[PDB]
Design a protein around this ligand. Structure first.
Ligand SMILES: OC[C@H]1O[C@H](O)[C@H](O)[C@@H](O)[C@H]1O
Ligand SMILES: OC[C@H]1O[C@H](O)[C@H](O)[C@@H](O)[C@H]1O
Lengths: 688, 688
């Protein structure tokens, strides 16, 4: 599927896009001149329109009014502001759900999901599909021929709320998905191990989705659950593809996207898979408060880039300050608004947008920050948004557009499907999920001055000097071979606990762990040692001999190969059986290359262990112990021009080596002759 | 009923049974010769088969095939391995629930319980009874005279998930049980105090089970709830009785059992009552991780013996290492495999089995340990299993079989009905339940080198030298006469807070606590003093004058009798009204015998207080301050042979006086001329 990036309005140059969700249909019409006036002053040059506007467009069944939308598009176009137009199909009107309550999502207990919030429709309902596909057709027909429209924003965050449906529509389509993937019922029975607890299937007609099995102390089929999660993603991908085929047929030159929600902990949609279906990848991401703020945002933006295969990507939403949807919504500290935007940009984005333009006075999102606060033009956030628009204009003129996130020395593998598998309630421990571990390695390498590339499992991590395999619970035979081949030919691999436990069907590998690849890794494990404080006197941590500490889970390593070296061992009470067992090992395999980390060390423990592990593998690290003070993010043009961003990672002002080049952008920082200065949350960009 | 013990295969001697749930229907057929081979090598002499095999026996309605099952039974019989055969009725096929969804269990809130796990049937559903009782006939008809079958494993773990059903079948059957228990509606009104909040019943037709009352802040009738729990247990007991009757009719000489879930915390089925319905008692028990590991398993096994009235019993399931069903599933430490089995064996088991033979690759229980792990015969678990089989063969040859768990000096009373009663949500505090107290008493006497016998309340505790009455919340007049008579004639009693609060209908006794027994105990209490940290500045503990601390709840002892002595008082801020009040008293009554403990002490508090209490009661305790280091469990033959087992209770290697006689078994232990050595988790057995 070819990359096609939204293009300028007629007579404008190519620029970093900079905008917001705009919702003028929630204000009186006469607010729009001020909006536009402030958007111009802020250097805003695109808005996303009509995302949730279904009910103000098809105002009653069969009745489509476009006037208010055409008027504001006109006003925006005359001002030089492009329009990312939504399909308007995110959330249906009251008249549609009143009249057809059968579009309503059902939860795992059979609860109806009422109107009164959003995205409360069943992804596989035919009635709902027909309405959507009609609105799509009407929107497209009305706006082909309209030159303000530069891209389609199809739907909105599919499966954010409606990922899991259990309606009879879902019952039916999950069967058909099973028939299509498995052909014959006996193939389904093998994939799921239905000979456990009299679950054996006679026919496809017998397959149900994992509805309520009584809650706690009751365990649903794990392979079925995996496939169900797969199916839920596919069902909405299918729905999205249909909406987009309809818009594209009528407006073939108009590039189409939908907004992803890629973040460290996202555990529903398989975005890498959806990525084959969009003309350019776009993402919505909101900061994690506290210490994780910087590293988890960088990690995420890197993964977007990975999912993107290094094509430029579109930041469709983030917050200027507080969000509204956590138990506690911290505000952003000074400089974090410009800094976070620059982090997404540094990680390859060529568009930077917010939810949303103007703060609502009312509705569930009234407390969600915006580009123009209820406090108005004379506010810190608006001033900062203006400074940010100028910075992006400056970076547009410096020629940053279309440069790629340069290729890191290390790839960190991310794998939603391994994440699904690790969510079963009957694993060795609920305290391990796949998603935390790749983030831990990303931060630890950053701590040692290394910017890793986060890559989905199907991307080309096997072309990097090095790869991290973190809790990659699912290993197929083709994955085994890819990994084997990689290390054979000179690859360095860091491989952790919880990797290669099962095949792609969640069928646990036999004869010892890691499954399939024990030859490459040169380690053998018969069982896990989970850790915690569930009951008094439980073994709750395991010290490691280099001064670190494992929590949640260690591997019990039974034996290692003759040419495996032990870098570190566990230190425990002798009654545990863990004392003196191998905790960190290194093992050659032809021209590589394999380190094994036999429990959860956390960002800090990985970081402590990195020098020793890398030395033994041949992977070179900056000797500077200031290495972790700053995150260094580099985009490259094919023509040779290099853009390097620096971010302070820490809670004090730091000083660092000035890179070569022209200083382009600076927030809470200072350029000098030898040394660059960065305040907390400061950032610099250089071209060289 | 008559004790019948499963008998050897033709031409075999009697041996301790040693085996597992075996699940050949989950594996390809050609795997069996390997199973049988490794079984022989491990000394396994029995397996339990077809427990969840409905779907592969009645493969469609009325269609019964037995081929695969006769095949494996033949391989096993050839290899000298007996079969404990299931009714196969534990969990119905997908075709049966497809066609008759009215079998599905209904929860407290009316949700359907779907297939996809197990035991999702209504205990009183007449349709499901029909199906089950036919499958029973077919199994019995097909296997009568087949000499490999040495026992029936009827259903599985009744009430493990389906204990509480709220379907119309349960509605209708609860009325019937009430009509049969009370005769007239006025007696129902009397037992449950329905004149509170306009609940008085006009007829049995108005009797409903305790469905949802709106949750938090709403409180269901506690007398009704009590009887409802009794009913849920009787309703499943009856189902079992019917299944079993259909089986012993066809096969009058094959002894039958069903697997109980006796453990310190279980709080559903009344196992002592069900024990009347089996030919021999069998139990599934899984370790508590941490400090509680040893004491809670010995407690539970002791209770099985008590429930068994000291007849030999059958450990039907336990884990070689980790289970799969806690949020954190720790593995067993080295030696705990053999030690735990020896603990069950020491407490009176003549048969030791695991769930399960071979670790599943798939299904909800794939992470549950087995005798033969995924990692294969080359694994520590399988090696330890082999050692254990040799050990149980050794003990077989020593003549342990049918030795009885010796009579302790103190019985500790357990009482499922009191447990039920203490579960209501409007008691003085939710941090008091009956079940923790007898366990605390077991562990404490053990710390003072006394192995108590845990006895259900209807067993003969009134024939021990001492009894512990721990939170026996329900006290009928007959129970009070039993305790009075026991103490009159020279008994020694330890009686705690939360005893004799209410009659057998949960109707609180009047005129002061403990009710009925105030004369025997010598203490009068008007109200409780609950303790905890729910609001700032709440009274959260009360120190006691012998240096212990009470938590969660204390009595307010208002007055003691003329001849009651105070051994210890509460110490507290004077404003509490608790400072100087009686905390532990002792009171003679004719030739006995009564100590009263007015609050929750913990294992440590009881342990610290035992010497002063036992000295004052005249109960002799070992003078050795090392007494708590090892747990001594003792089985006896009529011919006077004696099997003494010794277990290290502690987390350090311990040393102790060598027992007289022949060393039989050692694990993580060591023999010597004067002293015996036990490592943490060690065990030794001797015969004399
Ligand atoms: O932070 C809240 C924000 O989240 C995403 O960006 C949605 O697509 C927005 O419309 C809004 O709900
Ligand atoms: O610990 C899990 C295990 O527990 C009990 O023994 C059940 O009867 C088994 O069938 C199995 O589910």
């Amino acid at each position: 599927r070819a990359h096609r990036w939204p293009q300028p309005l007629p007579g404008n140059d190519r620029k970093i896009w900079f905008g917001a969700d705009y919702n003028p249909d929630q204000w009186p019409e006469d607010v729009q001149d001020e909006d536009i006036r402030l958007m111009k002053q802020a250097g805003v040059n695109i808005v996303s329109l009509a995302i949730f506007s279904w009910a103000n467009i098809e105002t009653s069944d069969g009745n489509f009014e476009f006037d208010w939308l055409d008027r504001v598009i006109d006003k925006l176009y005359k001002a030089g502001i492009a329009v990312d137009l939504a399909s308007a199909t995110a959330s249906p009107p009251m008249w549609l759900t009143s009249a057809h309550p059968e579009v309503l999502r059902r939860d795992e207990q059979g609860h109806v999901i009422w109107p009164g919030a959003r995205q409360h429709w069943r992804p596989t309902s035919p009635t709902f599909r027909t309405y959507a596909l009609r609105l799509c057709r009407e929107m497209a027909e009305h706006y082909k021929d309209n030159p303000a429209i530069v891209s389609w924003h199809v739907g909105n965050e599919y499966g954010c709320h409606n990922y899991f449906d259990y309606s009879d529509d879902a019952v039916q389509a999950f069967r058909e998905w099973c028939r299509d993937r498995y052909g014959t019922i006996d193939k389904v029975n093998a994939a799921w191990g239905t000979n456990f607890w009299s679950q054996r299937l006679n026919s496809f007609e017998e397959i149900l989705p994992p509805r309520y099995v009584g809650g706690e102390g009751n365990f649903t089929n794990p392979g079925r659950l995996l496939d169900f999660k797969h199916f839920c993603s596919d069902a909405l991908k299918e729905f999205f593809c249909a909406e987009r085929d309809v818009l594209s047929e009528v407006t073939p030159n108009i590039p189409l996207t939908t907004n992803f929600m890629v973040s460290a902990s996202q555990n529903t949609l398989d975005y890498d898979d959806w990525a084959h279906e969009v003309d350019f990848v776009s993402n919505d991401h909101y900061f994690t408060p506290g210490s994780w703020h910087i590293d988890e945002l960088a990690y995420s933006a890197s993964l977007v880039d990975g999912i993107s295969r290094k094509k430029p990507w579109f930041l469709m939403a983030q917050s200027t300050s507080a969000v509204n949807w956590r138990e506690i919504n911290p505000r952003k500290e000074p400089g974090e608004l410009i800094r976070d935007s620059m982090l997404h940009l540094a990680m390859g984005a060529d568009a930077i947008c917010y939810f949303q333009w103007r703060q609502s006075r009312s509705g569930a999102e009234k407390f969600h920050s915006a580009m123009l606060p209820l406090a108005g033009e004379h506010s810190q956030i608006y001033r900062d948004v203006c400074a940010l628009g100028a910075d992006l204009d400056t970076l547009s003129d410096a020629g940053i557009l279309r440069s790629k996130l340069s290729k890191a020395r290390v790839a960190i593998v991310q794998d939603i499907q391994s994440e699904w598998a690790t969510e079963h309630t009957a694993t060795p421990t609920q305290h391990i999920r796949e998603w935390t571990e790749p983030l831990d390695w990303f931060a630890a390498f950053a701590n040692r001055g290394v910017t890793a590339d986060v890559t989905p499992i199907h991307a080309q991590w096997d072309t990097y000097d090095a790869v991290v395999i973190p809790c990659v619970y699912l290993f197929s035979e083709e994955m085994a071979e890819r990994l084997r081949t990689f290390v054979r030919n000179g690859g360095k691999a860091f491989v952790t606990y919880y990797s290669a436990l099962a095949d792609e069907h969640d069928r646990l590998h036999t004869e010892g762990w890691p499954g399939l690849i024990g030859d490459v890794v040169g380690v053998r494990i018969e069982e896990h040692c989970p850790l915690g404080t569930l009951f008094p006197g439980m073994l709750d941590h395991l010290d490691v001999s280099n001064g670190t500490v494992v929590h949640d889970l260690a591997d019990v390593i039974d034996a290692i190969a003759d040419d495996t070296t032990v870098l570190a061992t566990f230190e425990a009470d002798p009654a545990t059986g863990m004392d003196g067992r191998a905790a960190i090992t290194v093992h050659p395999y032809h021209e590589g290359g394999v380190a094994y980390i036999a429990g959860k060390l956390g960002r800090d423990g990985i970081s402590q262990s990195l020098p020793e592990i890398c030395a033994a593998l041949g992977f070179e690290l900056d000797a500077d112990p200031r290495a972790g003070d700053v995150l260094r993010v580099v985009r490259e043009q094919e023509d040779g021009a290099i853009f390097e961003f620096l971010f302070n990672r820490t809670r004090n002002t730091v000083t660092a080596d000035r890179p070569a080049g022209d200083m382009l952008i600076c927030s809470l920082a200072t350029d000098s002759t030898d040394k660059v200065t960065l305040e907390p949350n400061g950032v610099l960009a250089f071209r060289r």
